[PDB]
Paper text:
However, this belief has recently been challenged by the discovery of a [name] serving as a major [name] binding module for human [name] ([name]), a flavoenzyme that catalyzes synthesis of dihydrouridine within the complex elbow structure of [name]. [name] is found in all eukaryotes and catalyzes formation of dihydrouridine 20 in [name]. However, in stark contrast, we showed that, despite the presence of a HD domain, [name] and by inference from the sequences probably all animal ones instead use a novel extended [name] version flanked by a peculiar N-terminal extension (NTE) and C-terminal extension (CTE) to provide the major binding sites for [name] substrate. By solving the crystal structure of this [name] in complex with a dsRNA together with extensive characterizations of its interaction with [name] using mutagenesis, NMR and SAXS, we establish that while [name] [name] retains a conventional dsRNA recognition capability, the presence of an N-terminal extension appended to the canonical domain provides additional residues for binding [name] in a structure-specific mode of action.
NMR identified R362, a conserved residue in NTE, as potentially involved in [name] interaction, but curiously its mutation seems to have no impact. A closer look at the sequence alignment revealed that the adjacent residue, R361, bears a positive charge and is also conserved. Its mutation slightly reduced binding, however, the double mutant [name]-[name] exhibited a remarkable 6-fold lower binding capacity for [name]. To assess whether the reduced binding capacity of this double mutant is a direct effect of the missing positive charges and not a consequence of structural change, we solved its X-ray structure. No obvious changes are observed as evidenced by a RMSD of 0.18 Å over 82 Cα between the mutant and wild type structures. Thus, the results suggest that R361 and R362 act synergistically via electrostatic interaction with [name]. Although, R361 and 362, both localized in NTE helix 310, are not contacting the dsRNA, they are nonetheless relatively close suggesting that they recognize a structural element present in the [name] and absent in dsRNA or they undergo a conformational change activated by the [name] substrate itself. This is consistent with the fact that [name]’s affinity for tRNALys3 is ∼3-fold higher than that for dsRNA whereas [name]–[name] variant exhibits similar affinities for these two RNAs.
Residue numbers in the entry: 347 to 442
């Protein structure tokens, strides 16, 4: 119904919570592929004066983003993928 604006959650990617190879970005890409959706599109947001990074991910016309800032583009993108999965109640590829 409504796919406008941005959906947010307070999330930060913790690599220790995930198996050696799988990441939230990979889980989200696979979910899109299984659902026959366009692959996720990531756009970086920066606060250069603080060396901070955020990412807004678009999946099925909806924007998702963490409320929190990260130390790199890569880390911000994993956070954005977590928001996308978690807000939808989807499995995130965690250990437990
Ligand atoms: C994917 As970008 C060009 O917003 O870092
Ligand atoms: Cl999970």
């Amino acid at each position: 119904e409504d796919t406008s604006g941005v959906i947010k959650m307070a999330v930060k990617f913790d690599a220790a919570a995930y198996p050696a190879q799988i990441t939230p970005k990979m889980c989200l890409l696979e979910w899109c592929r299984r659902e026959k959706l366009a692959q996720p599109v990531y756009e970086t947001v920066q606060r250069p004066l603080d060396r901070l990074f955020s990412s807004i991910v678009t999946v099925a016309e909806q924007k998702y983003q963490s409320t929190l800032w990260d130390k790199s583009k890569k880390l911000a993108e994993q956070a954005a993928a977590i928001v996308c999965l978690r807000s939808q109640g989807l499995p995130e590829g965690r250990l437990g």
